[PDB]
Amino acid sequence: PIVQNIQGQMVHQAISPRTLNAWVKVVEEKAFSPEVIPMFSALSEGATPQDLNTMLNTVGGHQAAMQMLKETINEEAAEWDRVHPVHAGPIAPGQMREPRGSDIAGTTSTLQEQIGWMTNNPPIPVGEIYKRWIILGLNKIVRMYSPTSILDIRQGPKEPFRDYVDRFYKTLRAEQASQEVKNWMTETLLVQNANPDCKTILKALGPAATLEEMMTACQG
Amino acid sequence: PIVQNIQGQMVHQAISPRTLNAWVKVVEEKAFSPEVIPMFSALSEGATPQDLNTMLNTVGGHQAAMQMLKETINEEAAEWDRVHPVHAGPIAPGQMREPRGSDIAGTTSTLQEQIGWMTNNPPIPVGEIYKRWIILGLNKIVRMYSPTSILDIRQGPKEPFRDYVDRFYKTLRAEQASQEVKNWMTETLLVQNANPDCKTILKALGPAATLEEMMTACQG
Amino acid sequence: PIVQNIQGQMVHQAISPRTLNAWVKVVEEKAFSPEVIPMFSALSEGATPQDLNTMLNTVGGHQAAMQMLKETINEEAAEWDRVHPVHAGPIAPGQMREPRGSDIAGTTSTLQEQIGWMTNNPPIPVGEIYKRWIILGLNKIVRMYSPTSILDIRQGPKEPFRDYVDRFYKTLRAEQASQEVKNWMTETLLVQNANPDCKTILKALGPAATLEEMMTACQG
Amino acid sequence: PIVQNIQGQMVHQAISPRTLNAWVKVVEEKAFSPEVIPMFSALSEGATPQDLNTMLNTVGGHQAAMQMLKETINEEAAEWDRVHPVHAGPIAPGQMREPRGSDIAGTTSTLQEQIGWMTNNPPIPVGEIYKRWIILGLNKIVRMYSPTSILDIRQGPKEPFRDYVDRFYKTLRAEQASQEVKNWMTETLLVQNANPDCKTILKALGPAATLEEMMTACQG
């Protein structure tokens, strides 16, 4: 990453082996859960595109997901290059050139250009865009990985309310719909799909249903 | 989390993967118990709101408890915004704009603004406020995860007094209704639910009896 | 490996035992997978040739592969000597001599000479050159360790498309070819060798369909 | 209503007996189907609040729905009066006073004041606001008359796709959800709730599914 020295320049620092070891361990042990995206965004903070490419290449197995992620990165780079013209010709000294999409991806550049783009005035953050693209790809992957849909969740007769709401909120975290649709479904289908007894309990609870009130009502 | 240097000043530092791993392990292995709040308060001392949002989003499973915590944080942020309205217009050069209720959580503010808020003159403790909110949410969560009520405790004819008092104090620390009510309960409900033989052995010592003699009476 | 030391003066820091243990463990646990190349390139960032020699000697087993690696390093050194001839004569007092192939391979070059060649201005990229050589050797080794040819990858009658595409892309990544050859192969070989039941499904989608469309088509 | 005379001043005109008879007939004949709101907005065009109150009072029966509509009008008037201050004191000639909520409701005003507020420069759409309130009330009413919910629609084994989608779109028109959430519903649940045969048919059809191609595929 790029560690900021205390009262000094933001010196570049190679990714420690601990970061990559934790990353390969989590991607091996936990497969592709919704939370891995937060842990990936946590481990890689202020990292150059070279660091992110190293973190992605170290992943072993699940090569279909890696190919989908690379295809998503390619689509985002194509869109960026289409909606942003690239200048050429002689460039004034002390000012880096226009970052290209294939260049903002880090596939057609070295570490020096990335460090220069992340140190210019005003700063042009390549890391926060390449990480955004990787997060979009990982979101597509975790959506693809979800085994069951959100509309097809039904509580079992003996399965309690806690396990049902756990599965429901997990699938909701895996869902791809917009945030307003997410609020709509978590407002309606939660009580609209419960078991009939606690369904009538929550109907007696009426409007303004709040999760803690629901779980305190369905007790026993 | 910020860390002091040799000269005495503090600056942002990337969150250690060991802290995240330990937190995820203690959350999953111990699930929810009264001894998760001290561990959380010790793990994230001086952590920025981004680090706390990381430590909360990283908790896979038990999504209902995390949603309860999110709702509690939302209510606390709304109350903070109601009690402290923010001023409009241009801000003074020597002062940074005060955070709103939602920005205390760090949901709509970058990390540099959090660092500036925490190391300002005078410093603004956004991290401590959000930690207090998260601790209150975790208290409500461990309240919900309480298996049984305090009144239903009745020692079995064969269940030893040690296991009875262990279960009693476990669900009592998990109750947290108050502190003086706890002091009255440990006098009345502890003596009221003993097995008849050891019950009258405890009654032989009167209400002035302490816990040590209380247990060594039924001991052996 | 040398590292930027406060302030701005690179000094030699010997290789840490934990890095060597991590390398030995990754070579023991993962054998010779395609991903090791990135793990090796990330474990030895900016390493002197002596450190890379240490990391190649600390390997246990696979002596045949290490012999191919050493022979390819020798071949690369011979080609470097044939392309970059070294003139004999007394050296300048302030500037270092141009290294030979044996000086790059760390065989006859003392640690002080390598530290000089690295920290001098302008720097001599001996570390990156030796890393390129070792990476070429590791590519040779991982392309040799391929159990079956990419042309032999065929799906079983009931083997799900998931494992089929996973194994196919793994063998394709282990295989060696230009990128355009891979672009042609992923379009000519992937759909043909699939199971007929899902082969009809992939054919119904279209020839130029992406991976995610086919994967969600034969999903389940 | 207020018919605009040809190349002349707009003249007030009493509501036509034909209009009122058509209104009471459609109410009596079709109860409260989702099209009564468009037909009401069609019949009542440019009408004063007196005309709208007459058109509402001529309705016979469904007194619960009428009381709910009056309560909705009262709530809208209360909100208007709360978010709009009312001026008092001497008023300049040729300029009408501030219209209160009870006046825009037509319960405390007269036809002269309504025509004055509808002829002022700039005009104040008292009729267009009272009609908006009546449409909100009629929407609440038609939502209350909805026999079944939208999430609980399932196609019968023999009931054809045409009848299924007819019922589905009728319930969707009756639904109260926002238009942004309304789209996702008709995109997903339509194909997610059909019979298995045409469900697999539309799944083979894949994305970009439109109603025309869906119905041409589910033929026979």
Side-chain angles (χ1 to χ4, degrees), chain A residues 149-152 154 175-178 180-182 184-185 188-189 192-193, chain D residues 149-152 154 175 177-182 184-185 188-189 192-193:
Chain A
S149 159
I150 188 64
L151 292 183
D152 309 328
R154 307 255 164 168
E175 195 40 55
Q176 68 182 357
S178 88
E180 72 89 8
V181 190
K182 283 199 61 152
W184 178 91
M185 43 186 47
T188 55
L189 310 164
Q192 279 193 358
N193 263 317
Chain D
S149 159
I150 181 64
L151 298 174
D152 308 329
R154 308 257 163 167
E175 190 46 50
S178 87
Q179 195 70 14
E180 271 68 1
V181 181
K182 195 168 179 174
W184 168 91
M185 263 163 58
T188 57
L189 320 173
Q192 282 189 357
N193 263 317

Side-chain angles (χ1 to χ4, degrees), chain A residues 4 6-7 18-19 22 35 38-39 42-43 45 162 165-166 169-170 173 211-212 215, chain B residues 5 9 11 14-15 17-18 20-21 50 54 57-58 60 62-64 67-68 144-145:
Chain A
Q4 285 202 166
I6 302 94
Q7 169 47 22
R18 303 201 157 201
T19 294
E35 80 266 5
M39 204 189 305
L43 293 173
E45 283 185 325
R162 290 184 171 179
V165 67
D166 288 330
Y169 262 97
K170 175 186 175 183
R173 199 187 195 188
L211 196 55
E212 56 264 22
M215 277 175 300
Chain B
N5 80 319
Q9 69 171 2
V11 60
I15 179 174
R18 299 220 314 275
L20 269 177
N21 290 157
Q50 174 165 342
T54 287
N57 295 324
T58 313
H62 309 261
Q63 291 283 3
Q67 188 68 17
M68 291 178 71
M144 186 202 71
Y145 277 100

Side-chain angles (χ1 to χ4, degrees), chain D residues 49 95-100 102-105 108-126:
Chain D
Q95 287 198 227
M96 279 60 65
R97 62 189 187 92
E98 204 276 341
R100 198 161 183 169
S102 315
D103 263 8
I104 196 164
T108 55
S109 163
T110 189
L111 179 64
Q112 188 67 21
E113 299 183 12
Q114 310 291 17
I115 295 179
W117 285 335
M118 262 176 298
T119 192
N120 199 19
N121 306 327
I124 308 299
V126 52

Side-chain angles (χ1 to χ4, degrees), chain A residues 9-65:
Chain A
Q9 302 85 9
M10 47 155 67
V11 56
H12 176 272
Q13 173 178 314
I15 46 180
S16 158
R18 303 201 157 201
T19 294
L20 291 173
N21 189 29
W23 166 244
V24 301
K25 193 172 186 175
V26 60
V27 72
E28 192 144 359
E29 291 188 13
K30 263 193 163 299
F32 267 119
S33 289
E35 80 266 5
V36 315
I37 302 180
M39 204 189 305
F40 164 72
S41 189
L43 293 173
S44 85
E45 283 185 325
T48 70
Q50 185 267 330
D51 313 318
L52 303 178
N53 276 322
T54 303
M55 291 178 56
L56 289 184
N57 290 335
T58 42
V59 163
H62 320 268
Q63 284 305 315

Side-chain angles (χ1 to χ4, degrees), chain A residues 18 20 57 63-64 68 145, chain C residues 42 162 169 173 211-212:
Chain A
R18 303 201 157 201
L20 291 173
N57 290 335
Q63 284 305 315
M68 288 172 65
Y145 253 87
Chain C
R162 296 283 304 278
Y169 278 161
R173 187 194 178 180
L211 172 62
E212 55 185 359

